[PDB]
Amino acid sequence: VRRTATEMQREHMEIQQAQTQAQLEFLQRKFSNKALYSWLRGRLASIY
Amino acid sequence: MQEQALTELDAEKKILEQSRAGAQSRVDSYRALYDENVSAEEKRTMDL
Numbered sequence: 745v746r747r748t749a750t751e752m753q754r755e756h757m758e759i760q761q762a763q764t765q766a767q768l769e770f771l772q773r774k775f776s777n778k779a780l781y782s783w784l785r786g787r788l789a790s791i792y
Numbered sequence: 793m794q795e796q797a798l799t800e801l802d803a804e805k806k807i808l809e810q811s812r813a814g815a816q817s818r819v820d821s822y823r824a825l826y827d828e829n830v831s832a833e834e835k836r837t838m839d840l
């Protein structure tokens with residue numbers, strides 16, 4: 745019983761890994777990411 | 793996962809109930825030994 749509880753702990757850990765990858769993927773695909781503000785920052789620094 | 797954490801204690805209860813059964817068997821053995829102090833035949837040999 746304790747081994748089939750720790751296998752469920754492993755499955756819980758794998759679904760936390762999948763959720764962390766979904767969060768990273770959301771921060772990369774989103775529009776207001778690092779790249780948008782990077783281009784806007786450099787472009788406004790030039791204009792300024 | 794909490795339900796597996798709860799059924800592990802129901803397995804622990806089975807462990808302690810088997811321990812309880814073994815100790816009850818030892819009590820039922822040694823009370824039978826202690827009540828019969830000397831047998832009916834251990835008295836015969838002292839008489840002999």
